[PDB]
Amino acid sequence: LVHVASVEKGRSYEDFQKVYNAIALKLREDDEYDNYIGYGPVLVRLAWHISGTWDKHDNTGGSYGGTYRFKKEFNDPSNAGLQNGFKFLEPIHKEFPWISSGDLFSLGGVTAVQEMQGPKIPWRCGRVDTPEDTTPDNGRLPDADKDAGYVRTFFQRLNMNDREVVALMGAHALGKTHLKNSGYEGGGANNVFTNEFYLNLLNEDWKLEKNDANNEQWDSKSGYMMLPTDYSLIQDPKYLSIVKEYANDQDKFFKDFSKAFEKLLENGITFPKDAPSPFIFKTLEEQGL
Numbered sequence: 001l002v003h004v005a006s007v008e009k010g011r012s013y014e015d016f017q018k019v020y021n022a023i024a025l026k027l028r029e030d031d032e033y034d035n036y037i038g039y040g041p042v043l044v045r046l047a048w049h050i051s052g053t054w055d056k057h058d059n060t061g062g063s064y065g066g067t068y069r070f071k072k073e074f075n076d077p078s079n080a081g082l083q084n085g086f087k088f089l090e091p092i093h094k095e096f097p098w099i100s101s102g103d104l105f106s107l108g109g110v111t112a113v114q115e116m117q118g119p120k121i122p123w124r125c126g127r128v129d130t131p132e133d134t135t136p137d138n139g140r141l142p143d144a145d146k147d148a149g150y151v152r153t154f155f156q157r158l159n160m161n162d163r164e165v166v167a168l169m170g171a172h173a174l175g176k177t178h179l180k181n182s183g184y185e186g187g188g189a190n191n192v193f194t195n196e197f198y199l200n201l202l203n204e205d206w207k208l209e210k211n212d213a214n215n216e217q218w219d220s221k222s223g224y225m226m227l228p229t230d231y232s233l234i235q236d237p238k239y240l241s242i243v244k245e246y247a248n249d250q251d252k253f254f255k256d257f258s259k260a261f262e263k264l265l266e267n268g269i270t271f272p273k274d275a276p277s278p279f280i281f282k283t284l285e286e287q288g289l
């Protein structure tokens with residue numbers, strides 16, 4: 001099972017920079033969503049959920065096929081709340097109908113990270129929409145009520161190592177939980193990309209409590225929360241070492257996150273030797289827009 005990248009016919013960097021700019025401008029103007037958090041965090045989640053169905057064993061799932069557009073995946077209970085990101089991107093897709101679904105969903109995650117003052121994330125085009133029958137079954141995305149052992153084992157399926165896992169989890173500095181989506185409540189409601197996740201993990205006084213949906217979560221007096229799977233990163237001695245590294249080195253965290261996130265969005269795709277180099281898009285700020 002091979003998924004070959006195929007560049008949308010006759011399109012070049014400037015075409016994709018246009019799509020980036022439309023997403024970025026809409027992020028700026030549709031700023032009231034989720035109590036003024038804006039759509040940055042949910043688009044990052046969306047890009048992760050469409051990628052995180054990949055299975056290294058048989059090469060099924062992942063971002064290539066854009067299969068989130070089909071009802072089985074769209075209605076996965078693990079995807080509750082992501083409809084909001086879909087609705088955000090829908091008018092963009094009408095404006096640029098030439099872009100594939102997988103390219104649009106993954107580009108939306110890249111745009112959101114960079115527009116939230118995160119690291120540059122190189123991105124490659126050429127995902128190709130595949131038929132409804134290529135949609136993975138529900139149940140490939142991870143549960144939040146588990147320990148470090150489960151996290152490590154789960155992420156092996158996506159071919160991610162300990163450092164890649166800890167770096168990717170720093171995205172939990174963004175956005176918040178919503179009781180209606182996941183049965184978890186609270187969070188910091190942040191829309192600037194920083195290494196605060198690790199600082200919070202190490203500096204807050206956490207207390208395990210049951211919440212209003214009867215799930216266990218870690219709460220701090222300051223009002224922050226951590227999922228059981230977040231808190232597992234300071235329970236396991238290998239993850240804890242890396243948490244301390246990122247808490248103490250913002251630049252290292254940005255660079256590692258960029259690498260891991262691009263790998264996540266590219267898993268399962270074979271790029272021809274003569275495919276274009278990855279693109280690095282300019283932010284609105286860098287264009288003076």
Ligand code: HEM
Nearest residue numbers: 041042044045048143144168171174175176177178181182
């Ligand atoms: C063990 C793996 C993970 C688990 C169990 C997990 C679980 C969750 C849960 C339960 C929520 C709250 C959903 C809601 O109530 O709206 C959430 C939010 C979020 N997750 Fe994760 N997550 C994981 C890994 C990741 C990764 C790898 C990323 C991206 C690189 C990511 C990005 C986000 C973002 C940005 C939000 C906030 C979304 C919003 O504010 O709407 N997560 N996650």
Ligand SMILES: COP(=O)(NC(=O)c1ccccc1)OC
Nearest residue numbers: 172173175176187188200224225
């Ligand atoms: C940085 O805010 P947080 O309170 N964690 C979150 O806001 C958060 C965000 C998304 C998913 C889970 C927690 O830090 C302990």
